[PDB]
Amino acid sequence: VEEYLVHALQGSVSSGQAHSLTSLAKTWAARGSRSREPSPKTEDNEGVLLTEKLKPVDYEYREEVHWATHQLRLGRGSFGEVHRMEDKQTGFQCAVKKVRLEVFRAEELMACAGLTSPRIVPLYGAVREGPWVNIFMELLEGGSLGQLVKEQGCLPEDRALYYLGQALEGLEYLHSRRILHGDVKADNVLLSSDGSHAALCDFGHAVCLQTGDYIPGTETHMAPEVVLGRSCDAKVDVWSSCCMMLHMLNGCHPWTQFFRGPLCLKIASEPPPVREIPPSCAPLTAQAIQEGLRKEPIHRVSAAELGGKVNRALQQVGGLKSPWRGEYKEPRHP
Amino acid sequence: EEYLVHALQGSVSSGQAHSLTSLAKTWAARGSRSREPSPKTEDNEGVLLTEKLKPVDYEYREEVHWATHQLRLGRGSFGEVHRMEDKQTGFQCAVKKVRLEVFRAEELMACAGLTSPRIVPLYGAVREGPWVNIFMELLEGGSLGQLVKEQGCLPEDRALYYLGQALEGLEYLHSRRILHGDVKADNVLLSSDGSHAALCDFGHAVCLQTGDYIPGTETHMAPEVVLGRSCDAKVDVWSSCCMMLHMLNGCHPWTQFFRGPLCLKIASEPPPVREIPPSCAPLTAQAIQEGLRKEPIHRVSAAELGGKVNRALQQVGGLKSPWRGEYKEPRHPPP
Numbered sequence: 001v002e003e004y005l006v007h008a009l010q011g012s013v014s015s016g017q018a019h020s021l022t023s024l025a026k027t028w029a030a031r032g033s034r035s036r037e038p039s040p041k042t043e044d045n046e047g048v049l050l051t052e053k054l055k056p057v058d059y060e061y062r063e064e065v066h067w068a069t070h071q072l073r074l075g076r077g078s079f080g081e082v083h084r085m086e087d088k089q090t091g092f093q094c095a096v097k098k099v100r101l102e103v104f105r106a107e108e109l110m111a112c113a114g115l116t117s118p119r120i121v122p123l124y125g126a127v128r129e130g131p132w133v134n135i136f137m138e139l140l141e142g143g144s145l146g147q148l149v150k151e152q153g154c155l156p157e158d159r160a161l162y163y164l165g166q167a168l169e170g171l172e173y174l175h176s177r178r179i180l181h182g183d184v185k186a187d188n189v190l191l192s193s194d195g196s197h198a199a200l201c202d203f204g205h206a207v208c209l210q211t212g213d214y215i216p217g218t219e220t221h222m223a224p225e226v227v228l229g230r231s232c233d234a235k236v237d238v239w240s241s242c243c244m245m246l247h248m249l250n251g252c253h254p255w256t257q258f259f260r261g262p263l264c265l266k267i268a269s270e271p272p273p274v275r276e277i278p279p280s281c282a283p284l285t286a287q288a289i290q291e292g293l294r295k296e297p298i299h300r301v302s303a304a305e306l307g308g309k310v311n312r313a314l315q316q317v318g319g320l321k322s323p324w325r326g327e328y329k330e331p332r333h334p
Numbered sequence: 335e336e337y338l339v340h341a342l343q344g345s346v347s348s349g350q351a352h353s354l355t356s357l358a359k360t361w362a363a364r365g366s367r368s369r370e371p372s373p374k375t376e377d378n379e380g381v382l383l384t385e386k387l388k389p390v391d392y393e394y395r396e397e398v399h400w401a402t403h404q405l406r407l408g409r410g411s412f413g414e415v416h417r418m419e420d421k422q423t424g425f426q427c428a429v430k431k432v433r434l435e436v437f438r439a440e441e442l443m444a445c446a447g448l449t450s451p452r453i454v455p456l457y458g459a460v461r462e463g464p465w466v467n468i469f470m471e472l473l474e475g476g477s478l479g480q481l482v483k484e485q486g487c488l489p490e491d492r493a494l495y496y497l498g499q500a501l502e503g504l505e506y507l508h509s510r511r512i513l514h515g516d517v518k519a520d521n522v523l524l525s526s527d528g529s530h531a532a533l534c535d536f537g538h539a540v541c542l543q544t545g546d547y548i549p550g551t552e553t554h555m556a557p558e559v560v561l562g563r564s565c566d567a568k569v570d571v572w573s574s575c576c577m578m579l580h581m582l583n584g585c586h587p588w589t590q591f592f593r594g595p596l597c598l599k600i601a602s603e604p605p606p607v608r609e610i611p612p613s614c615a616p617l618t619a620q621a622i623q624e625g626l627r628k629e630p631i632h633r634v635s636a637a638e639l640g641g642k643v644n645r646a647l648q649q650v651g652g653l654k655s656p657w658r659g660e661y662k663e664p665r666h667p668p669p
């Protein structure tokens with residue numbers, strides 16, 4: 001059972017619901033660990049589309065036949081490159097992340113599928129062609145928070161708070177659902193064309209809680225409990241979020257300007273990088289970051305808790321007033 | 335040599351094949367292992383074999399020193415293939431991007447430094463984090479596979495001509511102890527004028543001195559592969575003839591008469607010599623029979639087969655049929 005729904009889904013591309021896609025994705029992750037045999041001339045083609053804007057024809061959905069990528073690479077995710085694409089029948093434009101079966105984790109779809117938060121990039125479906133999983137999602141037009149930070153050097157306190165807060169909304173939505181993101185950083189939050197809306201993008205590091213099986217993201221954003229080899233929970237994301245905040249404010253990641261790699265040792269041994277908080281910051285801003293960067297996950301605030309403090313700090317600075325893009329602010333020197 | 339490796343690591347250098355080969359071995363070993371926290375700045379290392387691909391300050395990074403342009407060129411066994419231009423030299427070539435976790439050193443060991451006109455030349459390979467970028471000559475006449483499809487099936491002389499060249503390359507590899515492992519139309523690349531063909535994608539290659547042969551497309555697999563026996567270069571010879579049948583009929587060998595998996599059928603049934611078109615020349619048909627002998631031991635070598643194929647081409651009048659000629663309907667399946 002569900003072994004039966006799986007049998008019914010296998011071999012075909014169907015319009016359907018998240019649960020169906022999730023069930024299939026588990027089979028993809030299992031068999032990608034399974035070194036395979038001689039390939040059929042016609043690649044297997046199976047999956048589930050979650051929106052009518054992406055339409056299988058005769059239970060197929062194949063690159064170059066039913067849809068296609070546009071010239072230039074959009075970005076690069078943890079386990080696959082991301083491109084712009086078009087459904088050839090409906091004209092719909094979205095994004096696709098192409099992942100090798102052998103490195104495909106079901107959580108990549110399990111952690112966002114069917115989710116309906118504005119702070120989480122919507123999943124349109126996923127389709128397998130042979131040893132490739134194509135993951136379809138909303139195309140966003142304002143680039144990543146990571147790109148923004150690099151082109152502006154650093155963000156103003158208010159902008160930084162604004163994005164941090166929106167991200168924490170998404171994190172709260174995830175955590176209440178036993179979902180941990182695992183790679184919270186500027187490069188993985190995506191922006192609207194007018195910079196007003198931010199959303200979490202890449203769940204390649206996600207884990208679906210009940211731990212022990214957390215695959216670490218970027219070392220500078222790693223919490224002490226990860227680096228110590230201890231069991232991990234949602235608080236990991238809270239710490240990452242505050243590492244991202246420091247990055248937005250200073251234009252450089254925490255630890256980098258003071259230590260050399262690997263930073264794993266230093267993260268564990270050293271005190272939290274609260275010393276990297278800009279003195280120019282508002283009292284409520286600084287305290288929020290401190291509580292988010294508590295080395296003991298247990299005393300560390302939740303995403304919801306941190307979100308509140310951050311909304312209040314934003315108030316304290318006068319709300320969001322700094323202009324969308326704007327003028328370059330030189331990042332902090334080492 | 336553990337010292338040569340240490341000296342190359344962390345840097346992108348202009349250098350020689352052997353150096354690239356040694357580094358590539360570390361990549362295949364390192365693709366093994368759920369990893370640790372990633373450094374913020376991706377590792378960047380590799381070796382370029384031509385000055386037309388030029389690193390700056392020992393770096394070579396996508397979007398900085400080079401970039402892809404236009405639409406996907408193709409899809410190899412372990413990675414997609416694109417056009418790219420080096421931002422320093424303006425040089426255009428092709429790049430195949432392969433995930434570290436599925437990267438086989440043979441992908442480079444089997445073609446690096448090789449100087450046959452029948453084997454697509456390797457320009458180098460560069461790693462960025464969990465990605466291996468394989469650079470190679472960009473060819474302008476598409477793949478033999480694309481050709482066969484848009485023409486339905488090919489005229490006998492064209493087919494012989496391409497078969498012969500592939501066999502030249504195959505002979506070249508085998509004499510160097512290299513089995514390609516995925517010989518098929520999709521893995522032969524064509525000049526703009528259709529005159530030159532060369533073997534590409536060595537994702538299935540193995541470097542002889544089996545048990546370690548990763549099978550390609552089931553329809554091109556030899557009986558000894560499919561039985562799980564020890565494998566040698568003769569595997570490529572069988573595949574080549576499967577490819578020949580494909581060019582002639584516009585469809586792979588077994589597909590029209592059996593259902594998958596074909597593993598069983600290839601083993602049990604006689605060789606697909608019956609799929610040879612009767613209208614073919616005596617020498618053509620016989621060549622294919624010899625390439626498709628079920629015991630690899632009695633099966634002709636790539637060199638032997640090449641002579642027959644060249645002779646067959648003669649008997650038919652040499653290469654005369656036009657390039658991008660007229661559609662010829664591929665053989666239909668039975669009801």
Ligand SMILES: Nc1ncc2c(n1)-c1c([nH]c3ccc(Br)cc13)CCC2
Nearest residue numbers: 075076077095139140143144201202
């Ligand atoms: N869907 C989508 N729209 C826009 C972007 C991206 N994705 C995007 C960028 N880097 C990425 C890394 C992982 C993922 Br899943 C998406 C992106 C680059 C930012 C632009």
Ligand SMILES: Nc1ncc2c(n1)-c1c([nH]c3ccc(Br)cc13)CCC2
Nearest residue numbers: 408409410428471472473476477535
């Ligand atoms: N270097 C190069 N130039 C042109 C092409 C190709 N490669 C090409 C195609 N399919 C492929 C599959 C594997 C590889 Br390695 C190359 C190609 C499609 C043919 C076009």
